[PDB]
Each structure stands twice: as structure tokens, then as C-alpha cells.
Design a protein around this ligand. Sequence first.
Ligand SMILES: CCc1cc(-c2[nH]nc(C)c2-c2ccc3c(c2)OCCO3)c(O)cc1O
Ligand SMILES: CCc1cc(-c2[nH]nc(C)c2-c2ccc3c(c2)OCCO3)c(O)cc1O
Lengths: 208, 208
Amino acid sequence: EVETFAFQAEIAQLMSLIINTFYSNKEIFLRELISNSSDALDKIRYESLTDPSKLDSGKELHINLIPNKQDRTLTIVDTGIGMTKADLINNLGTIAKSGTKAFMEALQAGADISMIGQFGVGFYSAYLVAEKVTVITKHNDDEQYAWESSAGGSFTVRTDTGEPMGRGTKVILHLKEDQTEYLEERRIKEIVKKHSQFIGYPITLFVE
Amino acid sequence: EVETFAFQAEIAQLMSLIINTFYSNKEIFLRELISNSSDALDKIRYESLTDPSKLDSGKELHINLIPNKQDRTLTIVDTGIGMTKADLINNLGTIAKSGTKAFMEALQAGADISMIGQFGVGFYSAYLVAEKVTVITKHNDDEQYAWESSAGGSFTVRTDTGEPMGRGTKVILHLKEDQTEYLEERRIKEIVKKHSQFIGYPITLFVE
Ligand SMILES: CCc1cc(-c2[nH]nc(C)c2-c2ccc3c(c2)OCCO3)c(O)cc1O
Ligand SMILES: CCc1cc(-c2[nH]nc(C)c2-c2ccc3c(c2)OCCO3)c(O)cc1O
């Protein structure tokens, strides 16, 4: 079973600006995703302080960067708090309607696209480099869900068959044809060091 | 009634490093506090999307910067989600034990003190400029509380008498004698523009 939803008008607009604006500094997508992972990891660490049982679905709090040159996907996995079905539908837990409006007004007054994360909508920077994004997520209070979108104004949500992840969020970037540099090991390392060097959780870059 | 608590050893250590390390770029305290306010504002905006009644304690989502040269205090107020008594006691809702350890290890490997916010413990950067910090907070699910500390290994929590704030968090910096520059209007504006220029919520700098 697959449900299909329209993005709110404001998120459709944000997505179109990211996809259609000429902007060469596309590499900032990664620190935005890493920063999202870090926030979700913070959240599970804090909840676990009063209820250790929240970590029964995995004690290790970390981030994995997984390139696959065959599928042309870059995957950012964390073992953070994950998301419920309702959070996913509700702009992946972001304040995207108000965040987008504030971001637009900022762009009018001298901001640029790399400041997107300052408005709580950094997730959508994914579309700087990816033609399609799949988000798989598992919250302690819910089943595993798969969100997906190639933009165009719509996204799907379904229950995720098979591969149970325990707890956390997985962002699979199906990369644009001309953005394959972000599957190269030295490129990913360079970007982590440039933008995400000092982070509260370990980051493992998988090799192929 | 006043309760007195010991900081966990790790937070006592973080606090001592901030107070005793020679580090001239003290002005970053403000963007860390503004960034905390922004996160709390994000949180109430998101909760309000499924339950509008969460905003009955105030619809306006903003940040106020209030200097007072007579009391020598700089106060950062927001109308964010606020904090419960347990959050306050639990390192003001931060992941400060793990955050501190990660921050220390980062400092050993080329980080500096301005990266403190990357470890979820930016609040304590307050002690770069303040001899005593008072935090007043009001969550929808609780009464108004006052947290306070002049470091030295301890903090107090009490119920807050009188001045009800509706909803949010108030950080009153009782500034060190030699740090009065942060009460000057042009100094505060300069710092907001340098470090907190593009933020998802309005910031009002009160005049005297
Ligand atoms: C789809 C975007 C995304 C979300 C998460 C994530 N998992 N669990 C949570 C609560 C989050 C999350 C949600 C919203 C958000 C986040 C993180 O960063 C702060 C403000 O916006 C994540 O871990 C990675 C990620 O790329
Ligand atoms: C005492 C530190 C502080 C806290 C808040 C605040 N109010 N409500 C909440 C949930 C928060 C908060 C708590 C922890 C935290 C915050 C924000 O920034 C992200 C991670 O660490 C705040 O609004 C301002 C502020 O200076």
C-alpha cells in the first residue's frame, strides 16, 4: 500500500527554488543532513537519560556515510530518534511552512542557499544533488516507514518491507547524473572535514 | 523554598574550562543563546501544528535582547517551548555529559571554544561573560521556575515568584565587571549581524 501526498505550496516552492536556482556550492547538502542526524541523535541521547529502555533498539549513537557507485546512491544513516508516520508526512518533522517563508525573506535581504539550515529546512538541500530522495525511518513508538519524492509537487509514504533498521533514520540520495563526485571517497572526506569536522558523534565513511 | 544541586563532574569541568581558559573571542556567547532560543521556538511552532492550543500561552514567536546598565545584566528572552523543572535540573535540557566529553576530545584535536554549540552545550558559553546566570522558564506543562548559578560547582532551582511570563525562556546574564561592552547597543547589533544575521524569528534589541 502506497499513499501519495501533495507538498504544501510553500514546500513545493522551496523545492523548486533549490532545483532551479543556479548555485554551484551544492556540497553543503551533506553538512545539512549530518546536522539533521546529529539533532536526532541528541534527542535519543536525552530521552535515554531518564529511560534507558529507549536504547534497547540500539545503544550506539553514530552516523554512517554509504556510497554505492552501482546504484548511484549516497546514503546517510544515523541511529537517532527516528520519525513517526505523522512526523514524516508533516514535512519530516520540520517547521517547513514558517521556515520556508523566513528563508525566502532572508534570500531577498542578502542570504544565500547555504543558509537553508538556519531556517530548519536543510533536509531539502538534498535536491541540490539528488533526483530522488528516499527516507527510511524507525521511531521506538512506531513501525518502519519509507518516504520518497522526486519533487514534482508530491511525495509517497508506505510501510517499509523487510530490512528492519532497529532505530534511526536513513536518507538515500539517488544522485543526479552530473553529481557523481559525491560518491568518491576523497570528495566525501573533503566535505566532512570542510563542513562537519567537529560533531558530537562518530562518522564512518564506508568504502566500496 | 530553594533547592541546591551539584553539577555533574563533567559539567563542572566544562564550566571551569570556559571560566579559566584564556580566549578573547567571548562575543560568541550571544549567538549560542540566540541559537538555543531559535531551537526552542522551532519546537513550540512544530507542536502547535497539531495542537493550536499550545499557543494559548502566547502566539508570537520571537527573541528579545534586553540590556540594563543599572543592574549590569543582558537578558535574552524568547517565547519558545520553555522547560520543565526536570529539564532544568537535567542540564537545562542539554546532552551535557556526552556533549562535554565529545567537546573535550575535539579541543584536543584542533577545535576551539567557539565550536561549543556544535556539541549541544552552548548555553554554558554564557560564563565567558557572566559572573552569574539566572534562567527563568515556563513550559505549558508546568509552573514557572528559576534556575541560577555563579558556577563554583552548584546551581539552585526554585519556583519563580510573581512575574509570570506566559511561555518561554529568559536568560539573565549578570555580566562580569570587565564585560560591560555587551550592554552597549552598537556592540549587540554588531554581534547579531556578525553571527546571528539570518534567523527564523525576529530579534528585537531593547533600548534604554
Ligand atoms: C529527513 C531529514 C532528517 C531527519 C532526521 C531525523 N530523525 N529523527 C528526527 C527527529 C529527525 C529530524 C527531524 C527534523 C529535523 C531534524 C532532524 O534536524 C533538526 C530540525 O529538523 C535525521 O536523522 C536525518 C535527516 O536527514
Ligand atoms: C538554558 C539554555 C536555553 C534553553 C532554551 C530552551 N527553552 N526551551 C528549550 C527546549 C530550550 C532548549 C534546551 C536545550 C537546548 C536548546 C534549547 O538548544 C538546543 C539544544 O540545547 C532557550 O530558549 C534558551 C536558552 O538559553
